[PDB]
Design a protein around this ligand. Structure first.
Ligand SMILES: Cc1ncc(COP(=O)(O)O)c(CN)c1O
Ligand SMILES: Cc1ncc(COP(=O)(O)O)c(CN)c1O
Lengths: 388, 388
């Protein structure tokens, strides 16, 4: 296989856990599952098909063939319209978050987030000199009354809210999916205060129950009024590609794409976008997603099945409908450090819930994306044994 | 055969001139000269060599093999040391300028530039809410006394200076190269005021006399104190790749690389960086550069030689030692619009000097990078006919 690990080493990849550690920490894709061979063929085809145009400056919002297909995919998933002029290619959601935090917000502005949300996203906002304020959540995500109060309070305090940051589908870290009714209630609150929502949908294509799909995006439900949606190829084809996209209404997408950043450099990742375009065009992307989702489902079920047969009675686990993560809620007198100590005795790396915000009791995030079923089962056995 | 133009069309590439126009406007690489076949092999080689590691998140400051080689190349060119921990990979200088304008500057800060400088760079700074202030220049670039006055007056007014932006080698648009003595004088002024210099060196590798190398960078001459240097593969391999790098002192490179942007997304363009790394490793990059510099030299010499008649007619032209551009100065009584109207009658697109700042009399930028010598000669003939 071309998905070998001979160069999966510090200094090449972002992080490698210490030797001997079964790594359920990061939401990385298992190396054997990364579609190296598919992307090799994609670059081969794209460079032949697009020729010199693959190496020239790209069309500023992104090559139109990819724009067109991404809009059509959004519309099909939402059941609601999406025009190509609403789409703007990015070099990854991390870069898109940086762009929004510096172009749709100014230093000192506040970003409202759920009590638990993406830790490195918070770090982007903080490092862009934005203030963070958490909002109470339940098993369906941000609570509408709590958001209403936070926006009302912020106003009276003179705290300008730049945007509300939400990951509504296959939430990082809890795995939950916000249902339609909650989505509408949060949009109503945001509209009343006329505050922008930034909807980070990195896991949207990773529903693990076949023939089930997430509810329509916040952006589509709002008719793209005062919502920007961020999507990425990181969790479907490979994070190293540094390619994603952004959906907004035509006016805002157009405004962003006329920034000097885009006029100076063109499409934010042109050559790679054409490679990925060839995969969408041929159906190979969807064939890959079907196989990958089936691989993730098997890993989810192996990890859930082992933990459930083995966990203590006080630990609660809600099977996620998709994405990369399980969320364990111990609560009670259970101590996060004590649980992490058990993970260390087990030789397993997991992610501490406190990284993501405030938990009711103790919470732990475990990834099932990075290891095969048998190793996940072994990690659950070891964790269970240590924790008993 | 792979550097074809069958997809060199609106919606794929950034811009295409109107039909029938000989395009000496943009500093684009002639499509036939873009090394499509070379990059195809590079992606094939990188994905086979690096395997799954080419599609995972990359090492945050950039894969070490590329860092190490870029540091060594800087050291060789400067004749002065550069360590790999001083190098950060970027997704192009446009992105790097955005990052610096929003991380090392805040809205309302001033950027000092030469009276003539990169127009789309100015647009990045303005769209990031920075104020621009032009500083007088001569044939060697920014004047030190003028920079000192600009900084001293800014300090008097409490106008925070974010940085001084300079392109010292094969300047866009004039083509000049700042000599060593002027580089040191500017560094002395900036050091006394403790202001950062952002040194944009997009054309540094494009000296068109095979034995000649530019002077050492401002950054190296300063010992990387209070200078950040930006480099790109746009002008050497292809702008669509969206790949460049940044050189700074270890402390600043390290601080930038711990930003949430890099922790969240890893290397800013991982897969493409590995393809390009394989070209550096084999010598193929340098062999390409030798051939491409020879092609540019032929184009420069063709265009310059053909403009002989105009120069003897009062138009002034200083032949550039490198880069992509010629700069014509028409003098007094010549009007830029009149000259542009003649270009229109000639069916030739050129770049108005007013795009870049304040000219002494009329100035025009002509690119020799985008067309073969015969077409450049025909454009010169038509221009001279229209202007006579
Ligand atoms: C919610 C969320 N958004 C964004 C990202 C990263 O986005 P990208 O790889 O496209 O930069 C992650 C992966 N940790 C994530 O979990
Ligand atoms: C001075 C200068 N800097 C940067 C760029 C563009 O940089 P990049 O393609 O790496 O984004 C150009 C191209 N016009 C330039 O002339």
């Amino acid at each position: 296989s071309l998905s070998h690990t001979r160069q999966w080493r510090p200094g090449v990849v972002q992080e490698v856990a210490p030797a001997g550690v079964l790594d359920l920490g990061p939401g990385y894709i298992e190396p054997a599952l990364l579609p190296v061979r598919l992307l090799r063929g994609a670059y081969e085809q794209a460079l032949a098909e697009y020729g010199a145009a693959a190496l020239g400056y790209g069309h500023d919002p992104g090559a139109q063939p990819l724009r067109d297909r991404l809009a059509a995919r959004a519309a099909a998933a939402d059941g609601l319209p999406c025009d190509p002029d609403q789409v703007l290619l990015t070099s990854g959601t991390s870069q898109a978050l940086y762009l929004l935090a510096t172009s749709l917000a100014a230093p000192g502005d506040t970003v409202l987030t759920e009590e638990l949300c993406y830790d490195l996203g918070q770090r982007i906002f903080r490092d862009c000199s934005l203030r963070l304020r958490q909002v109470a959540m339940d098993g369906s995500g941000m609570l509408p009354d709590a958001l209403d109060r936070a926006l009302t309070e912020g106003a009276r305090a003179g705290a300008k809210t730049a945007f509300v940051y939400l990951t509504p589908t296959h939430h990082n870290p809890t795995g939950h999916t916000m249902p339609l009714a909650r989505r509408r209630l949060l949009l109503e609150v945001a509209a009343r205060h006329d505050v922008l929502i930034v909807e980070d949908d990195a896991y949207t294509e990773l529903s693990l129950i076949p023939d089930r799909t997430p509810p329509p995006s916040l952006a589509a439900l709002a008719g793209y009024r005062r919502v920007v949606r961020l999507c990425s190829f990181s969790k479907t084809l490979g994070p190293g590609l540094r390619l994603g996209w952004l959906l907004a209404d035509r006016e805002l997408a157009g405004r962003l794409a006329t920034h000097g950043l885009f006029v100076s450099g063109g499409s934010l990742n042109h050559t790679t976008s054409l490679a990925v375009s060839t995969l969408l065009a041929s159906g190979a992307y969807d064939r890959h997603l079907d196989a990958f989702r089936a691989q993730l489902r098997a890993r989810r079920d192996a990890l859930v099945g082992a933990l459930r047969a083995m966990l203590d009675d006080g630990v609660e686990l809600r099977t996620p409908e998709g994405g990369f993560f399980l969320w364990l809620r111990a609560g009670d007198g259970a101590d996060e450090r004590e649980l992490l100590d058990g993970a260390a005795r087990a030789g397993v790396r997991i992610a501490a819930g406190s990284r993501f915000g405030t938990t009711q009791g103790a919470g732990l995030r475990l990834a099932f994306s990075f290891n095969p079923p048998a190793l996940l089962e072994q990690a659950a056995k070891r964790l269970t044994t240590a924790w008993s």
